[PDB]
């Protein structure tokens, strides 16, 4: 009985067939500095059920249509009812056309409108972006429709399943270039009413979703290539970026990635061209618009001269991720936002596969484990987590839709899909994947459709046998939150599962239909030899001889952490794994060498092993040369450093880390020919970066020596930076720490003239490493000056200063003191008080510091705390948990480091 225009979901009575859309951005503002765009559209739709109302989305559009807000016509010889009135309903973002009679099923109608909106600098819908070319401020027009902003650019049935073809036309200044999803139909032609403008028409899109449309007017230039099949590939950027060669790496990898996916998906790339564009400051990162993918510049462009290898890794993975969607997400589209996790989780997994194809020597696939698996496990091991799936009827408003785009959706999505591919086998997974894409091309699906297609492939073969249906298995991993710890007693081979929470005193109140039991694929290795695969059924406890060991035998579960779970053992089997790692580490796969560390520190947090057992698992690192296990140790120990770097625990901690890292430092010293040439592949470059960072930050004299020499050498010849980009962040930081105002002032001058964001970021970060109080305070004083520190870098800089053990009280005092830069930083920018608060309070671990934080909060009465309001409550609760952890752990940890630092 509620009126349909007060419901958030569209009626199903009318479905779109095709749209004409003409947009005209005005890149010169009016007298008051208002920028607008104008548009005209015609939507052709079909009546499925009789209705006397048309409901279509519209947001922030003013209508200038002759008569009512629309004109309505019948297609062919269909009669059309007269319009009664048109109204806009802001809450549900609709244009509502009330008719004097009913539309008729089977008939098609055309609805024409003319409209205009602000071309705002708001990164939503059709919007403007401003950037500098030297003396000059440039302004371009571009789009971001995802999720519910297509309706902010033209009236449309703005739900992803309501697919249609689109004929786009841009009217633009005649010396600019216009781009959209499809190629232009031909040359631009002059606008007859004013030939300073031109008209660019684009070929008709395939049937597609509104959230994937894009159109862009700019001065950008491209580098290009024509693939063997005739697909034109272009990378677009600012003219100066193109001329500097910054588009080349993206161009290099794009062809191979597209080829890999066409093969992987058993489906031709569905469009005639691929454009990718680098936009200055695009806050969303990247967006997979079909045929015209947008990226933040620094994510797509690459400067070999000044960029690190991790930087390069980001380019190729971000590209692989977006290109993945050109089939999965765009060709076959999930019917509703509640299934976003499947689209984003799938892309978040297969980005590693596409990237690996482009860079096959880098072993990129391994990176999903620290990058996504352990990352998301940190938040999925909380009582406040949520299942991957959400009922569709609970996801209605644009705010509810936006909440779907979180860590769980992307990273747990990737993790469980990777698991599924693995227990299926890739070949079988790819077979059902192809079957799904072929059956649903240009249509819409739910996750159940993918499971059904995977089930079809399973049922068509005899080799891979499952303990249940694909759906029943995946239901355990998608309908309930969290994941299990699998615990093995190797004396008996008994194996158990329970819902893993980091906080052992947590009360879980979200109920599960499965009582937090999973069906779990368990690979295992015994004395370095793969064993037969095992499935744990939906039981708390089971037994198998696979997990039963002889006294000199060791067993280890979840090879390469393909399964979304963590593993604990009895202490004896732990000691055996330890012995192995100490005596021949190569017998255990590198990812599992990392797993042992990752898992045991989490288990210690949850009180399932002693903290000393986790520490014991780092003892092998003195002989470890590879990236991942060292990364596991460093990630798991940053909290220890945060908690203890002001205490008597720190001496022995640093001493221990120096001992462990010295042989690695030495190794690279020789391997790199005295640091003159980098290791060859990515993982080894990453290992070297970490080794140097660890050596320097823990006070290894030989690392300090290297940093001073290199920075001294740079200062004596500023135009020839002798420091490879991989090593800059450490070398800069350590040399600044060791030096005084000469190094600091030099780095400041370098910062002030840096042209490249990444180099500027490293300098800003390294400037916070000074051990002079006065330089840190002077630096803090600069953070609020937009002439010296960009406002968008202010909080990040303060946090870097806070990270310095000496800068901790300076930053904290500065923040409390200047808190009333909130009455000048909520309505004129965001700032991010939230991140600032977290950063500056991160160390707090005493009742004394807790009392201070409470007293600061007592500037309540007015001022409040805007967008980090509770980023302050979180700080109080975090500090309490820190006080408690430090109290339980201080003694034990102290004595362990003393005991193990020689």
């Amino acid at each position: 009985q509620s009126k349909p225009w007060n419901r958030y979901r569209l009626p199903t009575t009318l479905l779109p067939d095709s749209y004409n859309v003409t947009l005209r951005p005005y890149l010169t503002p009016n007298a008051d500095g208002l920028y607008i765009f104008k548009g005209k559209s015609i939507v052709r739709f079909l009546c499925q059920e009789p209705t006397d109302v048309i409901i279509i989305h519209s947001k922030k559009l003013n209508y200038t249509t002759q008569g009512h807000m629309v004109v309505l016509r019948g297609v062919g010889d269909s009669q059309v009812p007269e319009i009664d009135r048109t109204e806009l309903v802001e809450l549900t973002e609709y244009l509502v056309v009330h008719l004097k009679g009913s539309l008729q099923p089977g008939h098609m109608y055309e609805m024409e409108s003319e409209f205009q909106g602000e071309l705002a600098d708001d990164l939503a819908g059709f919007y403007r972006s401003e950037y500098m070319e030297g003396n000059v401020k440039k302004v371009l027009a571009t789009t971001q429709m995802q999720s519910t902003d297509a309706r902010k650019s033209f009236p449309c049935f703005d739900e992803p399943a309501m697919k249609a073809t689109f004929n786009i036309t841009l009217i633009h200044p005649n010396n600019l270039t216009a781009l959209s999803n499809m190629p232009p139909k031909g040359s631009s032609t002059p606008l007859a009413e004013d030939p300073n403008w031109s008209v660019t028409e684009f070929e008709t899109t395939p049937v597609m979703s509104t959230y994937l449309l894009a159109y862009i007017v700019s001065e950008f230039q491209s580098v290009n290539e024509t693939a063997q099949n005739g697909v034109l590939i272009r990378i677009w950027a600012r003219p100066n970026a193109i001329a500097e060669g910054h588009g080349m790496y993206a161009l290099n990898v794009t062809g191979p990635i597209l080829n890999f996916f066409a093969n992987h998906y058993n489906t031709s790339y569905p469009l005639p061209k691929s454009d990718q564009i680098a936009l200055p400051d695009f806050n969303a990162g990247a967006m997979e618009n079909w045929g015209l993918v947008t990226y933040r510049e620094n994510a797509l462009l690459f400067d070999p001269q000044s960029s690190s290898i991790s930087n390069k890794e980001r380019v190729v993975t971000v590209i692989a991720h977006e290109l993945a969607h050109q089939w999965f997400g765009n060709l076959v589209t999930l019917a509703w936002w509640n299934d976003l996790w499947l689209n984003e989780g799938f892309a978040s997994y297969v980005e590693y596969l596409g990237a690996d194809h482009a860079e096959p020597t880098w072993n990129l696939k391994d990176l999903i484990v620290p990058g996504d698996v352990y990352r998301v496990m940190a938040v999925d091991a909380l009582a406040s987590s949520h299942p991957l799936t959400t009922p569709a009827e609970e996801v209605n408003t644009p705010a509810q839709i936006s909440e779907m785009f979180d860590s769980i959706s992307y990273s747990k999505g990737a993790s469980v899909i990777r698991m599924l591919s693995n227990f299926l086998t890739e070949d079988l997974f790819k077979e059902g994947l192809a079957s799904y894409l072929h059956a649903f091309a240009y249509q819409n699906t739910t996750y159940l459709d993918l499971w059904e297609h995977l089930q079809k492939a399973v049922d068509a073969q005899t080799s891979i046998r499952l303990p249940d249906t694909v759906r029943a298995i995946m239901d355990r991993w998608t309908l309930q939150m969290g994941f299990p710890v699998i615990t093995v007693d190797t004396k008996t081979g008994n194996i158990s599962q329970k819902h893993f929470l980091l906080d052992s005193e947590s009360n879980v109140t979200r109920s599960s239909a499965f009582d937090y039991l999973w069906i779990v694929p368990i690979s295992s290795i015994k004395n370095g030899v793969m064993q037969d695969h095992y499935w744990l059924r939906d039981v708390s406890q089971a037994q198998n001889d696979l997990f039963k060991t002889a006294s000199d035998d060791w067993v280890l579960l979840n090879v390469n952490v393909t399964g979304y779970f963590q593993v604990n053992y009895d202490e004896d089997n732990w000691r055996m794994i330890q012995h192995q790692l100490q005596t021949n580490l190569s017998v255990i796969p590198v990812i599992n060498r990392a797993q042992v560390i990752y898992d045991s520190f989490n288990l210690a947090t949850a009180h399932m092993v002693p903290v000393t057992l986790a520490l014991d698992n780092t003892l092998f690192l003195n002989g470890e040369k590879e990236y991942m296990p060292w990364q596991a140790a460093l990630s798991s120990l940053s909290y220890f450093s945060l908690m203890f770097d002001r205490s008597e625990v720190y001496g022995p901690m640093k001493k221990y880390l120096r001992k462990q890292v010295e042989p690695l430092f030495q190794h690279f010293e020789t391997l790199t020919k005295n640091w003159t040439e980098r290791p060859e592949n990515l993982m080894d470059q990453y290992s070297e970066i970490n080794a140097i960072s660890t050596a320097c930050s823990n006070g290894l004299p030989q690392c300090e020596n290297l940093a001073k020499t290199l920075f001294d050498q740079w200062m004596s010849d500023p135009e020839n930076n002798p420091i490879h980009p991989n090593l800059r962040s450490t070398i800069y930081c350590n040399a600044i720490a060791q030096g005084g105002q000469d190094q600091w002032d030099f780095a400041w001058g370098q910062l002030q003239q840096a042209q490249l964001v990444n180099e500027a970021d490293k300098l800003r970060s390294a400037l916070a490493c000074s051990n002079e109080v006065w330089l840190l305070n002077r630096y803090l004083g600069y953070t609020l000056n937009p002439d010296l520190i960009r406002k968008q870098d202010a909080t990040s800089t303060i946090n870097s200063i806070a990270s310095n053990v000496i800068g901790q009280p300076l930053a904290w005092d500065f923040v409390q003191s200047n808190w009333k830069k909130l009455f000048q930083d909520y309505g004129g920018g965001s700032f991010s008080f939230s991140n600032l608060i977290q950063g500056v309070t991160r160390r707090f671990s005493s009742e004394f510091e807790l009392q201070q934080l409470e007293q600061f909060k007592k500037n309540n009465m007015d001022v409040g705390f805007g967008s980090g309001t509770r980023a302050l409550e979180q700080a109080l609760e975090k500090t309490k948990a820190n006080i408690k952890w430090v109290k339980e752990n201080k003694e034990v940890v102290l004595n362990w480091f003393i005991e193990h630092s020689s």
């Binding site: 990162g285 997979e288 984003e344």
Partner: peptide, 6 residues
């Protein structure tokens, strides 16, 4: 979308 999405 990838990065900061809504």
């Amino acid at each position: 979308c990838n990065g900061r999405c809504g």
